[PDB]
Amino acid sequence: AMSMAVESTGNAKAEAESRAEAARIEGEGSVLQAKLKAQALAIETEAELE
Amino acid sequence: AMSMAVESTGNAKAEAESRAEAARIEGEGSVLQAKLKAQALAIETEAELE
């Protein structure tokens, strides 16, 4: 029972923490792309404003 | 009866605690993605506001 508990919790935590790490990387990437796209829109619409 | 009790409770607790650990990792991941996506929206809509 102890061995099954540790194996099952390791198997679940691996597939859960890989997803969590990938989601963290995607969140940081998404906010950085949000900054870059914000600059892109704020300059495109500013020039098109003129 | 004692052996069956311990085996059944170990087998149930393994499949229950793996799910609980995976759900905890998913919750932490989800809140971190919520922060990152919150920053992404708060900058995208801010630039699009301009």
From Swiss-Prot, chains A, B:
It is found in: Cytoplasm; Nucleus. Phosphorylated on Tyr residues after EGF stimulation. Dephosphorylated by PTPN11. It comes from the Eukaryota. The vault ribonucleoprotein particle is a huge (400 A x 670 A) cage structure of 12.9 MDa. It consists of a dimer of half-vaults, with each half-vault comprising 39 identical major vault protein (MVP) chains, PARP4 and one or more vault RNAs (vRNAs). Interacts with TEP1. Interacts with PTEN and activated MAPK1. The phosphorylated protein interacts with the SH2 domains of PTPN11 and SRC. Interacts with APEX1. May interact with ZNF540. Required for normal vault structure. Vaults are multi-subunit structures that may act as scaffolds for proteins involved in signal transduction. Vaults may also play a role in nucleo-cytoplasmic transport. Down-regulates IFNG-mediated STAT1 signaling and subsequent activation of JAK. Down-regulates SRC activity and signaling through MAP kinases. MVP 3 mediates interaction with PTEN. MVP 4 mediates interaction with PARP4. This is Major vault protein. The lineage of its organism: Eukaryota, Metazoa, Chordata, Craniata, Vertebrata. The chain holds residues 711 to 760 of 861 of the full protein.
